[PDB]
């Protein structure tokens, strides 16, 4: 396996290309509006 530890989130040092998918995911699942 020789598998290192990389994050799946670019704030902690993972692959930065999934951030264009990560943030828009919770932009597509938030269900929160202004009070």
């Amino acid at each position: 396996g020789t598998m290192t530890f990389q994050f799946r989130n670019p704030n902690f040092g993972g692959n930065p290309n999934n951030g264009a998918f990560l943030l828009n995911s919770a932009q597509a699942q938030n269900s929160y509006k202004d009070p």
Binding site: R8, G14, Y32
Partner: protein, 243 residues
């Protein structure tokens, strides 16, 4: 960090509890050659071998701490003969003895190391929260053959394997909490089984498989050769049928 010993597996606990032989056999380990021909993939280096080139130094520990063999230094034999030639020029200004016979030798190889043999992983992620369990099961295999150096005959040639369990558990969340607020966090743990410890534990498995298959053939006898009761030899006789 606490510098303890090598974290030996369960097979070493069967190794020290082996019964004593009628004198520990003089044996010699020249070069258990890493002829896997297998180097580590990306992200690791291309010149980095996937298993260590050091099974000639690991088997020495597996034969010495087994309390069955007296291993002889034959890895750096040309480094030892350069020291013996110095004592020939040192005492000629205790007399020097000769090297022992080592009537059997354990030549062998690391015969293979396929990356990601039974690898795989389950992933699950709901709204925000999520975790995966990705395990990359490698498999090393070593050859250990006892060779009678007086006749060249290979006496007991066994092939033991060990599945390197390199698993990762990344539990990463990405969840909005309030309006224009976002919590996220990723706890991750990749416990790679070290290939040096699985090279060590498959060799220590092979030493018991050298001894157990070296008893029924009549190659060497142990002290009190009537028992056959200890749960190391009968366990490695029920493990003598390969799956």
């Amino acid at each position: 960090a606490r510098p303890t010993l090598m974290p030996r597996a369960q097979s070493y606990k069967d190794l020290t509890h082996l019964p004593a032989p009628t004198g520990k056999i003089f044996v010699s380990v020249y070069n258990i050659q890493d002829e896997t021909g297998q180097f580590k993939p990306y992200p690791a280096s291309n010149f980095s071998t996937a298993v260590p080139q050091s099974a000639t130094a690991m088997l020495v520990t597996a034969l010495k701490d087994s309390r069955w063999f007296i291993p002889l230094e034959r890895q750096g034999l040309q480094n030892l003969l350069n020291e013996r030639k110095i004592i020939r020029a040192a005492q000629e200004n205790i007399p020097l003895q000769s090297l022992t016979a080592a009537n059997i030798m354990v030549e062998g190889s690391i015969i293979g190391y396929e990356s990601n043999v039974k690898s795989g992983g389950v992933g699950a992620r709901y709204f925000g929260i999520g975790a995966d369990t990705q395990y990359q099961l490698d498999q090393i295999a070593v050859n250990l053959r006892v060779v009678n150096v007086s006749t060249g005959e290979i006496l007991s040639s066994v092939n033991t394997s060990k599945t390197i369990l390199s698993y990762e558990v990344q539990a990463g969340v990405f969840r909005f909490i309030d309006y224009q607020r976002l919590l996220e966090g990723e706890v991750g743990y990749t416990s790679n089984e070290p290939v040096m410890l699985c090279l060590m534990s498959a060799i220590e498995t092979g030493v018991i498989f050298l001894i157990n298959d070296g008893i029924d053939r009549g190659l060497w006898d142990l002290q009190n050769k009537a028992e056959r009761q200890n749960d190391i030899l009968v366990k490695y006789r029920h493990m003598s049928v390969p799956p």
